[PDB]
Each structure stands twice: as structure tokens, then as C-alpha cells.
Amino acid sequence: NSIQIGGLFPRGADQEYSAFRVGMVQFSTSEFRLTPHIDNLEVANSFAVTNAFCSQFSRGVYAIFGFYDKKSVNTITSFCGTLHVSFITPSFPTDGTHPFVIQMRPDLKGALLSLIEYYQWDKFAYLYDSDRGLSTLQAVLDSAAEKKWQVTAINVGNINNDKKDETYRSLFQDLELKKERRVILDCERDKVNDIVDQVITIGKHVKGYHYIIANLGFTDGDLLKIQFGGAEVSGFQIVDYDDSLVSKFIERWSTLEEKEYPGAHTATIKYTSALTYDAVQVMTEAFRNLRKQRIEISRRGNAGDCLANPAVPWGQGVEIERALKQVQVEGLSGNIKFDQNGKRINYTINIMELKTNGPRKIGYWSEVDKMVLTET
Amino acid sequence: TNAFCSQFSRGVYAIFGFYDKKSVNTITSFCGTLHVSFITPSFPTDGTHPFVIQMRPDLKGALLSLIEYYQWDKFAYLYDSDRGLSTLQAVLDSAAEKKWQVTAINVGNINNDKKDETYRSLFQDLELKKERRVILDCERDKVN
Amino acid sequence: DIVDQVITIGKHVKGYHYIIANLGFTDGDLLKIQFGGAEVSGFQIVDY
């Protein structure tokens, strides 16, 4: 039997597209398959994301996989609440509680608050970015209002590609005159290498400075550039290579050809592509448990237009979203426990420092326990 | 979206309307590609945007000129999410430049569930650290 | 090759001093250790 799903992928997001088909070969058990139906679009213009969304509604899809930027987040979460066609995705979690949307990516905002308590800071400057979002900034302003440590939260996402090197330097010249020796970066990977290369030239990576790269891919950025210098670079990582299943995947991921899967011949896997790999398990676990209870999925024969005076929902989608939520399976990330909101709980974030021979774990964060000291 | 496409079917020359923080991008994406012009009294979009004309002027310039005129350096700030986050981004850049110890605390997530208990606790955490200069900044109902 | 292994091990802050001592001082790339704060003297005969 063939389940039609929908794939919204960014232009140039090849490794996220490559980790999709790896889940398609391996995780599609022989009892049932699911038709992939990938569409290509630019994530920024919400004209385009509107276009392929109704196009998947015109073809008819039971669950949609995609990526949303901050620019087009409220096109998706508003549509899926009004057409009941649920949405599973690795992007950053929305503000508050939006329904019908399954966030594969874990929330992070407690752990960064947890880690500053661990190292006992007071002066952490927090360099953020716009297109990742602002919700993490809002959590560490009021909590820094509550426990009273200064936050010199400076935007850096405004910078154009013509005049990068001047403004990054005039940034860190201002943290020098304020005597700021603790910096937190919070960006997508493509910006984090750009900041840390402007660090390595202006020379802020000696003993005495401390960093927290604070996205989920901590080893995914290159850390041979600031390795040997003496900057204690902590991080956060969910895709832990010490596990058997991940070490089994790296062996599988290395055995795939370069022209067939771009970014296959690597020893490390990006956190977006890793959650893309775990999402295809969670999607397939849903339609498996959908057929075992034999809940029949009635589809309109020719769906038509999404632009209708009020567009009628179809209540088999209500069956789908409960099947998407009621899944507890293991993955690369850990114990996938979804609430009714679409978030994750009972997940481990591995606090991982940087000693000179390479990245080393020093504990784990969850919602239950904040800082655990894994070995007078 | 539905009001936009239905009016684009009716043969309109320009579109006059409002937009909140939620659907700020849907109009600026559509009117950019479809080349219909949009004049609006809503809040101004951060950065440039094609084919959209904001009637309401900017504000962040005057709020940075006013604080310099009162010689402040220690002031709280009670923003609202749904007007935008644009003004909060502006003063925190100026927080680095002139030693403003801004204590910016959200207020918009607080809703009709817990009204009087939470707001007094908000003023307590300003008073216990002795904040005197509270630039609250929001729509008129949250002002009231 | 030496000065790139300097820039990774971080010996180019205020407090270190260098003398590249061949005759081509601007001929080597000096945008790598420029902004850091290492007072890099040199020697040059081909004066522009």
C-alpha cells in the first residue's frame, strides 16, 4: 500500500535530502512503503511555500515533512491548524504551543540556562541571529533579569557579505573595552564558522576566554581551528557517536557514494540530517500503528483547491495526528517522547567540552536533572 | 491569504489593510512577487521590503534620542511580542555602545489566566533590584 | 607555514613579538597576523 507524503526541502540542503533517502531504503519495512514526493523550494519567500503547500493538498498527502525558516513559520503553523494536515519537521520549535506540528528538534533553552549556572558566570555576552529565531534570547533575558547577571546581547545577523570583516572586528573591539571574556554564540552552522574565523584572526581564543557554541551540532562545525589554542569551548550535542546505533549508522553512512548522496563520505553527521533520519522512522512507525488498528484513511478522490470559502477539514487527519503523537521509539537522538504539544521530553543533551585531543563529554542534561558530572 | 487571493480575483488596483506580527511575512512575500502595492498603518517591517509602503513612521530613532536626553543608563523595559521585536533589537545594540544596563522583561505572554498576581511580581523584581525608569512599550490595551 | 602554526596555537596576542627576517616582508601574507596584536617587525629593500 502506498502512502503519499510531502517533502519541502531548501535549495542547497543536500545533506538533509541525502539523509532522507537513507531512511527510505532502510526504515521502509517490507509490509508497506510510502511514496516520497519531494518538492524543491526556497524557504524564505512565503509565496513559494504557499505554492507547494496547496500543490501537495491538490495531490493529496497524509503527512508533510519540511523545513521552515523564521521568515515563513507562520505560513505553515496557521495552514495546518486550518486544514488538519499535520506537519513533522526538524526546524526550531515555535513560540508557545502551536498545534498540529510535530517538532523533531529538541528545545534547548533550559540547558543554556543550566550551563551558565554550572560555570558560575555573570557577564556573558550573547551573540544571536535573526533567522534562527529570537525565542532563545527572550528566555535568557528574563531569566537573567530574575537571577541578575548582565547580558550584552548584541545582534550580529544584520551583517552583509560585502563588509563582514569590519563589523565583526568592531563587535569584538566593543567586548574588549567592556572586558567581556565570556561569549555565547547562537547561530546556524554557516554563521558559526564565520564568527569563529573572525575570532581566530583577532585573537580571542587564548587561555582566559570561554565560549559556548549553542546549536545542537557542536562537532559539526570545524573545531580544529580553535582546538589547540586554549579557549574552553563548551557545547551541546544530541547525536552521540558513542552509542551502538549511531556507530552502526556512521559505518552505513560512510559506505554510500559521493555522487549518489552528497555529503555521504563523512565521519560526522549534521544534527538536521540526523533528525531527518529519525523522523522517517517516526513517520513510518505512525502508519504502521495506523494499519495495525486498521483505522481506514479515507481520501478525497480529487481534492481541488485550498482556496475555498471555508475549506472543509477531513477527520481522518485527526486519526493521523494522534498516530504521529503516540509514538515512542528509539533513534539517533535518544528516547523520543512526544507530548500532546508536539515537542520532546525525556531527552538527553550531552554537554560536551573541548579538550586538546578533541571533543569530550562531561555529562548530560534533561528536564529532570540539569547538570550531571560524569567522571579529592 | 484567502482575503488576498479573493481580492486579487476581483481586479484590485491596490490593497489597504492591516497585519499583526503573525502574518507580517505573508503580505510582504505576496506583494513582492505579485507586484500589487500594499499601503498600511501597521508596524514597519525590519529591513527593506519591495512594493510595501508603511504609513506609520519609525520610532526607534526617537526612543534612542529621548533616553539620551534624560541622561539615563539604568532602565527596565517591558516589551510586547505582538507589536514586534524590532524596538528591543535596537536598544540592545545601543546597550553595548553606551553602558545601558537594560533589564528587558517580556510581559505579553502573561494572559488572562493570572492577571494581578504576576504583574505585581514583575514590579517586585524591578523594585528589589531598585529599577526606577520603566519604559513600558506595547499596544494601548496593555498600556491601559 | 610557521606563522599558520602560530595562528592556531595562539601566540600572536599582545605580549609576543616577531621578526620575520628575510628580505621579503610584505611578500609573505600579513593579513593573517595583522589584526591580532603581535608587533611584527621585518626587513625590506624593495620599497614601494
Report on this structure:
It is classed as membrane protein. Keywords: AMPA receptor, ion channel, neurotransmission, synapse, GSG1L, membrane protein. Structure of the complex of AMPA receptor GluA2 with auxiliary subunit GSG1L bound to agonist quisqualate. Chains A, B, C: Glutamate receptor 2. The organism of A, B, C is Rattus norvegicus. This is part of a larger assembly, with three copies of chain A. By secondary structure, chain A is α/β, with parallel strands linked by helices. The first copy, chain A, contains ten helices and 15 strands. In chain A, strands 1, 2, 3, 4, 5 and 6 form a six-stranded parallel β-sheet that branches. A four-stranded parallel β-sheet of chain A has the order 7-8-9-10, with no helix packed on it. In chain A, strands 11-14-15 form a three-stranded antiparallel β-sheet, with no helix packed on it. The longest helix of chain A is centred in the C-terminal third of the chain and has 22 residues. The radius of gyration of chain A is 22 Å and the shape is globular. Chain A starts with a strand and ends in a 15-residue tail after the last strand.
